[PDB]
Amino acid sequence: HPIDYAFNEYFLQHQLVEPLNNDIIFNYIPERIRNDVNYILNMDRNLPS
Amino acid sequence: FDFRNSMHMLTSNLTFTVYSDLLAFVSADTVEPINAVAFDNMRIMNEL
Amino acid sequence: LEELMRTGDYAQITNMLLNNQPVALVGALPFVTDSSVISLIAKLDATVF
Numbered sequence: 001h002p003i004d005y006a007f008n009e010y011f012l013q014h015q016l017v018e019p020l021n022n023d024i025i026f027n028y029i030p031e032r033i034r035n036d037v038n039y040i041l042n043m044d045r046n047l048p049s
Numbered sequence: 050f051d052f053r054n055s056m057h058m059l060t061s062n063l064t065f066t067v068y069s070d071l072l073a074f075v076s077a078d079t080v081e082p083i084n085a086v087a088f089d090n091m092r093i094m095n096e097l
Numbered sequence: 098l099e100e101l102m103r104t105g106d107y108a109q110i111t112n113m114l115l116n117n118q119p120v121a122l123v124g125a126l127p128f129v130t131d132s133s134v135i136s137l138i139a140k141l142d143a144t145v146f
Contacts, residue, residue: 001055002054002055005057012059012060012061015062017065017067020068025071025072025074025075028071028072037080037086037104037105038079038080038084038085038086039077039079039080039105040077040078040079040080040105040106041075041076041077042076042077042108043074043076044074044076045074048066078105079105080103080104080105081103084103
């Protein structure tokens with residue numbers, strides 16, 4: 001219905017869901033620490049598109 | 050009620066997989082305490 | 098190696114091994130003697146690593 005399409009529509013055009021790369025995980029990390037030798041970082045699980 | 054004016058087409062994505070918490074995928078160990086270093090780099094706790 | 102298991106390995110080695118590049122290692126090590134020529138031709142020693 002006009003008013004219904006109205007709704008559900010925007011719900012689609014606002015799917016607050018961004019992608020995700022190993023890189024982003026790495027990044028949700030303080031610019032520091034990574035640059036603090038004392039601590040070890042590494043990847044193990046893969047990432048599906 | 051007029052049909053054609055009510056019928057719409059749908060742009061929907063297909064098969065995600067939502068992840069929460071996150072982090073976890075972070076494999077991380079740690080040096081042995083006796084080997085600490087500050088921004089300094091010479092070593093923290095160096096009085097043997 | 099001493100400065101490795103200390104430094105927490107900077108995936109430096111991890112990369113070189115992965116990418117297959119001519120390199121060496123140093124320090125205390127466990128040798129292992131084998132005979133039956135065979136082993137050699139099969140180029141067994143490329144394993145372990």
